[PDB]
């Protein structure tokens, strides 16, 4: 009477990014076979050995059929890099990134490392930042920048 | 029934200044036609070809009607500048901007760069800002300002 | 149909106090005429030219009738000043203002710049202010002040 | 059958010594008028503008008559004092008062200036306080005190 | 339906800790007598006289019966002490106590002064404590401790 | 409205491996009896004596019933350690661990002391960490790391 769902949680041992359709392939290949938590399976892909560990099966044992839901667990970080030669000083705020170069130029980026504001000021003396609001101070004038 | 908000965002490829009433002209002409994100439309103004790109439509597709909100995008952030020659020191607070000039005068603006208070004190020694309350301190007396 | 009220806001360019019945007299003279924001009117009072500017007409334009509400604005913020000669140190707290004078005397005021407590201590060494409580420390004695 | 008395409590904002019969004069002037809590009245005394505030009226609104009792209060805040000779250092916490004497003795009082804990430590080196928990550090012993 | 519960609030003038059964003894002695707020009663315990003041009776006058609830109002502190000789430095955290001894040993206790972890590191250079996580840093080894 | 719970923490004095259902057996024997912190119970198993000490009863005294949760204590805290030679500086955050080594290498671990990001920068000048966002500053470029 009570309906019980079937789900298998898998995790990859080597650090590699899988294609969008990887899940679809694993469904097609595994169906018909029975698996239990703790098993380790070796698959040859693109002439390279990749090991997959079964994290947990609900229920255990589990039989793989088209209806079974399969989920992959992964936790990689996104690394972004911008080449900057001759950095002078760096000011970091929880939700804003401000970098000053030796050339008396100020660049303002967001969390996504995208360029929003660019200005050069000969008489740049001080730069102040608070949350998402930024202000540039130069002997000639006051610049107020609002995001 | 339930009312759902519709919005269309347009941006011009060339950098040109549009009249304030531009929105009024556009909506009246375009109503009745359907547009989808990515479309390109050409409009002739005073014998000049300007290309407008449809940045986004919510929902997509979108039907252009007088009741829909149409907005023009020009810059990612808002930039305001004020010429101030001979700045001595600048104090920045989340909701207050205080600038002190060599002439021993104190100017207090808000985030919108509008003038709220103006005073000059020969014996100006210290200026302090805390929360929505601001105070100016001079050897002869104390000025307390409530906003 | 929702009803919209009628209100006119006026501001005087010169800083002068108007008689108590001034407002009522102006109302009588104006009613019957239509006014719009930005208009400037000149009135001769006791051989002195006082210029009044129309700050805002709600709605614009506005018709002046007996039923219309009239408000005169003097200042946008509240400025209070107190004479204090020979200030040595000043401590600001979210809801308290404490001033220490070279004469070894401590004055405690509230946000409204009113005097609550006055005490002088020959051997005054430290003044501690936190949130809403005040404590004065001198080598001879300890004073506990509860707001 | 029920007895109901009429009383008004007034407080003067400026700190000035009033003559013994001052209350008598005020009563004579005020009777016949009705007053409500919070009202502020300005009176000229000896060529000085004194502001009197109505602290409370029992009952409110109160009608001043010959039989109405008026009391003069002059306590804007609660002030307590303790005599202490040779204080070494004072540490103030949100809800605790800790005083260290030159004789390497530690006394802990509450907001009410009452004695809760008392100890002496020859090798007293440091005192640490955070929240409602306090600890005393001496070269020989670690003392932990829970409020 | 309206059942009225009776309560008597007592407070002692001298500060002393009472045994758990103290309340029971008082009740036995009092029943049968009538008491009103403000009365003073003297009880001899352990050869020392203690004076108890009746803080308030609800309702008054109250007749003491077995069914009356008696409550004692006091604000005493709990003192726990551990012998520790040769303390080097002490760091206090909101819910953790970390002590470093001259012998380069690190002790981690909780608020109750109970020992959770004991370790010793010859090359102890720094100790960091924040939130429910603590870490010990020595030039040879890095230790991560989850509490 | 109010939920009540009972828990007993027990610890064995001799080091012996107990079966998974050992807890169940103890429960059956003890129920019906009252226990208090500090009591010692002796159980005969296979002719060998094993003593169990009652570490703490919550609340105390406690009556053991089928609904009471019984827990066995073995590891009060989780300690994990890694060998690291030549540590230069260490910065700890509530949910992030950043370590900098003398060899100009930067290691970023999570709470579980697992490698998430590992890189080396000859010209490493400054390292700044805030919340789950990490930034590395080197003369060559700016590195932004998003968790």
Automatic annotation (TrEMBL), chains A, B, C, D, E, F:
Residues 17-79 form the CDC48 domain. InterPro entries: Cdc48_dom2, CDC48_domain_2-like_sf, DUF6849. Transmembrane segments: none annotated. The keyword Metal-binding does not apply. Coiled coil: none annotated. Keywords: ATP-binding, Nucleotide-binding. The keyword Lipid biosynthesis does not apply. Signal peptide: none annotated. GO terms for molecular function: ATP binding. This is CDC48 domain-containing protein.
């Amino acid at each position: 009477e009570g309906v019980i769902m079937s789900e298998l949680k898998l995790k990859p041992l080597p650090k590699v990014e899988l294609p969008p359709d990887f899940v679809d392939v694993i469904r097609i290949k595994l169906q018909g076979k029975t698996v239990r938590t703790g098993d380790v399976i070796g698959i040859s892909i693109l002439g390279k050995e990749v090991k997959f560990k079964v994290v947990q099966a609900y229920p255990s044992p589990l039989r793989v059929e088209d209806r079974t839901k399969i989920t992959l667990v992964t936790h990689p970080v996104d690394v972004l890099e911008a080449k900057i030669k001759g950095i002078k000083d760096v000011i970091l705020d929880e939700n804003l990134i401000v970098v000053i170069t030796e050339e008396n130029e100020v660049l303002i980026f967001n969390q996504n490392l995208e360029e929003l504001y660019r200005g050069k000021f000969e008489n740049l003396n001080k730069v102040l930042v608070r949350n998402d609001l930024v202000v540039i101070i130069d002997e000639q004038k006051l610049t107020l920048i609002r995001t």
